[PDB]
Design a protein around this ligand. Structure first.
Ligand code: HEM
Ligand SMILES: *[C@@H]1O[C@H](CO)[C@@H](O[C@@H]2O[C@H](CO)[C@@H](O)[C@H](O)[C@H]2NC(C)=O)[C@H](O)[C@H]1NC(C)=O
Ligand SMILES: [Ca+2]
Ligand SMILES: [Ca+2]
Length: 336
């Protein structure tokens, strides 16, 4: 049956080239299979590439974007001039080279490097991986990426037009559990968005719900809110979506189970990877993707804060019982 040149067994001969780009990305792009800044920039890139898709622009007779087509790399010259795409040139060039050198399409390569990067971060699910997305693209239309200063209505309408329900917007946001900011407030470069930027866990949902108490840098940056402890950055859209009645109950159900969070996240990501494509025309090469190491820590309210410090915003469901840590307040180191 299909055994690839390297002795691995796969479902289809179309999957064999991906064991070679797996080796290149792990050794080089990810610097020895690490979960550091290259994984976080690729998670920004996969979203910014796939969300350039708008059925409403198509309906009005305009080109609406090809979705998860790799247009952010093939047309980086126009797309990296967009407001939301700063701080990405170096990662896009590293990916362009792996793509040209292995003979794989840019849209497939971004989806693949996202599943491989996430496998380097403890706690992550195994993301689905499909191959066969066409390599040709047209530049994404501008203004299709949600920004941190937008209202929840603006974010839900843009996301809804691409096809996601309010629940799936919250599910997709689990990627901010592996995150920092570099361009919102340059003064606290790489300040984490949750206290474990290297563990794909529930802490992002717990901590954006805590009362904003601390200014982490000299001044406040673009779309920055007060955060719960030194070193942690809180962006306005995350604070608002955690508290809005349209998204608050789903945000609260994501706080106590890393297992439920990862299932939901895997499902929204599989939907986001085929925006602009018919998944039945693609080949499944999910077995090429390795397992991540498991996360054995339980969810916690960090540093002595309790349930009285979180601003419960889901009026129907009571806040789940999460553990407390007998701590002094943490000060987070920049994400690596
Ligand atoms: C409501 C939509 C979203 C908004 C408004 C938003 C906004 C942002 C902003 C402004 C940054 C900081 C970038 C910087 O200055 O360095 C950021 C970082 C990040 N976002 Fe989001 N985001 C959203 C959705 C997502 C989605 C769905 C993903 C991917 C599945 C994602 C993954 C990330 C990651 C991993 C980072 C960290 C980048 C790094 O540490 O270098 N975001 N996001
Ligand atoms: C996918 O399309 C892009 C063009 O949009 C190709 O990228 C170019 O590849 C050539 C030769 O391989 C390089 O010298 C160019 O610099 C690349 N241009 C850009 C903008 O990256 C790419 O080769 C195509 N890949 C496949 C498999 O067809
Ligand atoms: Ca695109
Ligand atoms: Ca985390």
């Amino acid at each position: 049956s299909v055994t690839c040149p390297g002795g691995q067994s796969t479902s289809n001969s179309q999957c064999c080239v991906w064991f070679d780009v797996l080796d290149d990305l792990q050794t080089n792009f990810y610097q020895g299979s690490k979960c550091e800044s290259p994984v976080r920039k690729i998670l920004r890139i996969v979203f910014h590439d796939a969300i350039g898709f708008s059925p409403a622009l198509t309906a009005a007779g305009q080109f609406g974007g090809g979705g998860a087509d790799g247009s952010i790399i093939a047309h980086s010259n126009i797309e990296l001039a967009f407001p939301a795409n700063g701080g990405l040139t170096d990662t896009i060039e590293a990916l362009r080279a792996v793509g040209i050198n292995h003979g794989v399409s840019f849209g497939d390569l971004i989806q693949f490097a996202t599943a491989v990067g996430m496998s380097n971060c403890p706690g992550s699910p195994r993301l689905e991986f499909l191959t066969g997305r066409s390599n040709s693209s047209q530049p994404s239309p501008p203004s299709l990426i949600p920004g941190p200063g937008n209202t929840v209505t603006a974010i839900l309408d843009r996301m809804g037009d691409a096809g996601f329900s309010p629940d799936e917007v919250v599910d997709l946001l689990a990627a901010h559990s592996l995150a920092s900011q570099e361009g919102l407030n340059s003064a606290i470069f790489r300040s984490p968005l949750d206290s474990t930027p290297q563990v794909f866990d529930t802490q992002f949902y717990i901590e954006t719900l805590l009362k904003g108490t601390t200014q982490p840098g000299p001044s406040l940056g673009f779309a920055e809110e007060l955060s719960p402890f030194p070193g942690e950055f809180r962006m306005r859209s995350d604070a608002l979506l955690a508290r809005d009645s349209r998204t608050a109950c789903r945000w609260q159900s994501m706080t106590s189970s890393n297992e439920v969070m990862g299932q939901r996240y895997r499902a929204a990501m599989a939907k986001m990877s085929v925006l602009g494509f018919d998944r039945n025309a693609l080949t499944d090469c999910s077995d090429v993707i390795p397992s991540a190491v498991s996360n054995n820590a339980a969810p916690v309210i960090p540093g002595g804060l309790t349930v009285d410090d979180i601003e419960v915003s889901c009026p129907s469901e009571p806040f789940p019982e999460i553990a407390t840590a007998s701590g002094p307040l943490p000060s987070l180191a920049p994400a690596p």
